[PDB]
Amino acid sequence: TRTLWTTPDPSPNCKVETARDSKLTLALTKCGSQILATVSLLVVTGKYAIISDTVNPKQFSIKLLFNDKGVLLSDSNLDGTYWNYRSTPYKEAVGFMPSTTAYPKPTDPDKKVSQGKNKIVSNIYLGGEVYQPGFIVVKFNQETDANCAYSITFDFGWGKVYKDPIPYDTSSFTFSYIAQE
Amino acid sequence: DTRTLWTTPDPSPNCKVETARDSKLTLALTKCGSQILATVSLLVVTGKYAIISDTVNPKQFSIKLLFNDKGVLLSDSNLDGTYWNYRSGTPYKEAVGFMPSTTAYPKPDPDKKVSQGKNKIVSNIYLGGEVYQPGFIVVKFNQETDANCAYSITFDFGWGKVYKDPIPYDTSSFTFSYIAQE
Amino acid sequence: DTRTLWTTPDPSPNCKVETARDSKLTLALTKCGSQILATVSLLVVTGKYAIISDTVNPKQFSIKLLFNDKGVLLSDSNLDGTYWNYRSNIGTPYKEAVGFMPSTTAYPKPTTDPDKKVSQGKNKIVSNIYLGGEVYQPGFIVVKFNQETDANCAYSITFDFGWGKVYKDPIPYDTSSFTFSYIAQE
Ligand SMILES: CO[C@]1(C(=O)O)C[C@H](OC(C)=O)[C@@H](NC(C)=O)[C@H]([C@H](O)[C@H](O)COC(C)=O)O1
Ligand SMILES: CO[C@]1(C(=O)O)C[C@H](OC(C)=O)[C@@H](NC(C)=O)[C@H]([C@H](O)[C@H](O)COC(C)=O)O1
Ligand SMILES: CO[C@]1(C(=O)O)C[C@H](OC(C)=O)[C@@H](NC(C)=O)[C@H]([C@H](O)[C@H](O)COC(C)=O)O1
């Protein structure tokens, strides 16, 4: 029942547009065959720090790329310095990776492969205000960058018209997925 | 318990939407003490709901998992029980620990009013995982009476948005939890 | 531990929206190491918010769970602690539940550098819920962590319930169940 996280109060640790322009808070907890996750994002500087209807595109991507031992690769948008188990860098986390059987890397109707199953899509709310919806898309194992064995990708965006600019500062989002091990 | 009861993570067609085995229901239930953590997704592979558009009616269908008092799946369920089993093909004998509580979610003076909302979980899912293709899911606990079931988990799937260009009914994954019987 | 803190299976009203015992809160918190897994639902049985429509204002109300530094529920909470205990002890109240409290590091109590900007969204979880569980009857829920200062609380979990859709025919404020998780204090 271990937890792999960014630490709960991270310094800027994540690239949206430029290095460390945002704070990703991400906690993964192993509940046997499923991982329970909570994620939130605050963009602190740059193009997406304060958004409005003039900003385009209205979506950006945060990639976590892992090798076959579940170690985060430096090509990830997330900086690995404080990505570790909750209390030395960790050696292995295959247990926390999204399953390549449930969520295979991209490649008879019984052989139709689902396009939806490897994604989780919901609204989040900017500043936690019910009248400031945006969206999150979590994707498992959809990346090919850096020859990753596994990947978790967060697409953040919005669609509602905001004429008065507001911080891109998401409510916390809970999700779960089938673990590799 | 941290045990998992599931369809297997990559099932063959295993579920009836319109006809038998016309879809692949991926469902994993993991026991976290007396709450179950669940993840569900649906891919309809053949028949009326494989490719939907505004001309298909009705725009909602029901998938019932019906259990006896040992938590064993009854064959009247929409889900085929052949590979519904604990993660580890001998069929399991007991899974009451994974059933929705009949105290928190009973089968159907202001102080004595009973909640109709609490046995349901309702949310959007997104076909193909695209933010512009919403559909919906309703998870219902213990609301079936079919086959003298002692427990039930029902998944209602549907959509409301107009889709003139047809799209596969291929849901994003949906997470939920519920109070376990024991 | 892997225990559960919940509203106990007594069927009486256990919560105050507007007046004492006008509502029935269902909440279960289950500890998964450093994360809490939760499910919450609310039925208002009497008073202003039992049956709602567009002529009811405001369209939001708040249910506060306030805890001391041992994780014990304070009597200033909207939830009547008569009905709040570990699931198992019927007459023995719990002494300690710090492990179920929302982290004050992840979710600090409210109080120049952009890099030191404090997230306003992170301590909230916001979603639709659906009245009666009907897909055409959306309402909303806002779960907030540690944002209260009432009663010198050490920790808090606040549920704001409301709705925005225009309703002509009155409908019971009877929410679908909502799952969420949060980072635990320890
Ligand atoms: C009017 O449209 C919206 C909006 O974009 O603002 C849609 C918005 O719903 C979504 C999914 O974006 C809704 N928010 C929630 C969490 O219910 C939101 C609220 O229901 C609404 O702002 C609440 O208003 C009142 C009267 O309390 O309404
Ligand atoms: C126009 O309304 C909709 C739609 O039917 O497409 C509603 C849709 O929201 C819902 C609850 O269906 C929304 N998707 C999400 C995940 O929020 C979706 C997104 O806001 C929109 O597609 C995103 O647009 C941009 C500019 O990225 O907008
Ligand atoms: C027309 O707008 C709405 C509504 O307010 O009723 C928006 C409503 O969505 C939201 C986010 O409120 C939607 N329900 C769901 C769960 O997606 C809902 C359903 O798609 C719609 O009611 C579907 O109709 C039936 C009965 O199948 O449509």
Residues C126, C171: Cα–Cα separation, whole Å:
22
Residues C177, B107: Cα–Cα separation, whole Å:
16
Torsion of CA B126, B127, B132, B135, to 10 degrees: -60
Partners for C (CB, 8 Å, 3+ pairs)?
A, B
What is the DSSP annotation of C1-38?
---EEEE-S--S--B-SSSTT-EEEEEEEEEETTEEEE
Q: Using CA coordinates, name the residue in chain C closest to A32.
A: C32
Give the total residue count for chain A. 181
Q: Which residues of C touch B112 (CB under 8 A)?
A: 11
**Residues B77, B80, B83: CA angle, nearest 5 degrees:** 135
Which residues are CB-neighbours of B102 under 8 A, at least 6 positions away? B142, B150, B151, B181
CA distance A170 to chain C (A): 5
For B117-168, strand residue ranges (E) read 120-126, 134-141, 151-158, 167-168
Residues C172, B104: Cα–Cα separation, whole Å:
19
Residues A101, A104: Cα–Cα separation, whole Å:
5
Residues C17, C21: Cα–Cα separation, whole Å:
8
Residues A62, C90: Cα–Cα separation, whole Å:
48
Residues A133, A125: Cα–Cα separation, whole Å:
4
Q: What are phi and psi of A147, to 5 degrees?
A: 55, 40
Residues C29, C73: Cα–Cα separation, whole Å:
14
Task: Count CB neighbours of A179 within 10 A.
Answer: 23
Contact status, residue A136 vs residue B173, Cβ threshold 8 Å: no
Chain centroid, CA C76 distance in Å: 14
Contact status, residue C155 vs residue C149, Cβ threshold 8 Å: no
What DSSP designation does C184 have?
Answer: B
Torsion of CA C29, C30, C32, C37, to 10 degrees: -50
Which residues are CB-neighbours of C11 under 8 A, at least 6 positions away? B112, C24
Which among C34, C124, C125 has CB closest to A29?
Answer: C34
CA of A78 to the centre of ligand 2 (A): 26
Q: Which of B181, B163, B168 is nearest to B50 (CA)?
A: B168
Q: How far is CA B43 from CA B107, B112, B129, in A?
A: 29, 41, 12
Q: Which of C162, C23, C8 is nearest to C85 (CA)?
A: C8
Q: Which residues of A touch C128 (CB under 8 A)?
A: 123
Residues B50, A51: Cα–Cα separation, whole Å:
38
Chain centroid, CA A9 distance in Å: 16
Which residues are CB-neighbours of B123 under 8 A, at least 6 positions away? A122, B136, B137, B174, B176, C127, C128
Contact status, residue C16 vs residue C62, Cβ threshold 8 Å: no
Q: Which of B67, C34, B129, B112 is nearest to A87 (CA)?
A: C34
Omega of the bond prior to C58 within 30 degrees of 0, cis? Answer: yes
Q: What is the resolution in angstroms?
A: 1.9
Contact status, residue A66 vs residue A81, Cβ threshold 8 Å: no
Q: Which of A23, A63, A71 is nearest to A153 (CA)?
A: A63
Determine the 3-state secondary structure of C82 from DSSP: helix
Q: How many CB pairs below 8 A link A and B? A: 103
Report how this structure was experimentally obtained. Answer: X-ray
Question: CA C115, C120, C125, C131 torsion: positive or negative?
Answer: negative
Q: Which residues of C touch B177 (CB under 8 A)?
A: 30, 37-39, 179
The single residue listed with the structure tokens 């089968």 is B107
Q: Residue B131: CB within 6 Å of ligand 2?
A: yes
Test A119 with B172 for CB contact under 8 angstroms. yes
Determine the 3-state secondary structure of C83 from DSSP: helix
Residue located nearest, by CA, to atom 12 of ligand 3: C138
CA distance A4 to chain B (A): 18
* Ligand 3, pocket residues at CB < 6 Å: B 59-60, 122, 124, 134, 136, 158, 160; C 128, 135-136, 138, 165
CA of B108 to the centre of ligand 3 (A): 25
Residues C29, B13: Cα–Cα separation, whole Å:
35
CA of A134 to the centre of ligand 2 (A): 9
Q: How far is CA A171 from CA B57, B94, B121, in A?
A: 36, 39, 20
Give C 115-134 residues with CB within 8 A of chain A. 115, 117, 119-128
Burial (0-12, 13-18, 19+ Cβ within 10 Å), C134: middle
Residues A120, A148: Cα–Cα separation, whole Å:
20
Q: What are phi and psi of A81, to 5 degrees?
A: -55, -45
Chain centroid, CA A94 distance in Å: 17
Task: Count CB neighbours of A66 within 10 A.
Answer: 24
Q: Residue A123: CB within 6 Å of ligand 1?
A: yes
Residue located nearest, by CA, to atom 3 of ligand 2: B132
What is the DSSP annotation of C106-138?
TSPPP---GGGPPPSSTTEEEEEEEBTT-TT-E
Say whether residue B2 is in contact with chain A using an 8 A CB cutoff.
yes
Pinpoint the alpha helices (H) of B17-109. none
Say whether residue A36 is in contact with chain C using an 8 A CB cutoff.
yes
To test the contact with chain C by mutation, choose from B30, B113, B156, B174 the residue with the greatest count of C C-beta atoms within 10 A, namely B113
Torsion of CA C168, C170, C173, C178, to 10 degrees: -40
Q: Which of B41, B58, B55, B46 is nearest to B170 (CA)?
A: B41
Q: Which residues of A touch C30 (CB under 8 A)?
A: none
Q: Which of B178, B106, B116 is nearest to B142 (CA)?
A: B106
Contact status, residue C129 vs residue C141, Cβ threshold 8 Å: yes
Burial (0-12, 13-18, 19+ Cβ within 10 Å), A53: middle
Q: Using CA coordinates, name the residue in chain C closest to B60.
A: C135
- Structural domains in chain B, CATH included, are 4-179 (2.60.90.10)
Q: Which of C62, C68, C34, C45 is nearest to C173 (CA)?
A: C45
CA of A140 to the centre of ligand 2 (A): 21
Test B119 with C177 for CB contact under 8 angstroms. yes
Say whether residue A27 is in contact with chain C using an 8 A CB cutoff.
yes
Amino acid letter for position A150 = Y
Q: Of all atoms in ligand 1, which is nearest to the CA of residue A123?
A: 11
Question: CA A120, C174, B79, C29 torsion: positive or negative?
Answer: positive
Q: Of all atoms in ligand 1, which is nearest to the CA of residue A133?
A: 12
Residues A69, A78: Cα–Cα separation, whole Å:
17
**Residues C119, A4, A32: CA angle, nearest 5 degrees:** 125
Residues A175, B11: Cα–Cα separation, whole Å:
22
CA distance B145 to chain A (A): 30
Q: What are phi and psi of A109, to 5 degrees?
A: -65, -30
**Burial annotation A31-44 (CB, 10 A radius, 16+ → b, else e):** bbbbbbbbbbbbbb
Task: Count CB neighbours of C162 within 10 A.
Answer: 18
Contact status, residue C97 vs residue C70, Cβ threshold 8 Å: yes
Say if strands C35-44 and C23-32 run parallel, antiparallel, or are unpaired: antiparallel
CA of B132 to the centre of ligand 2 (A): 5
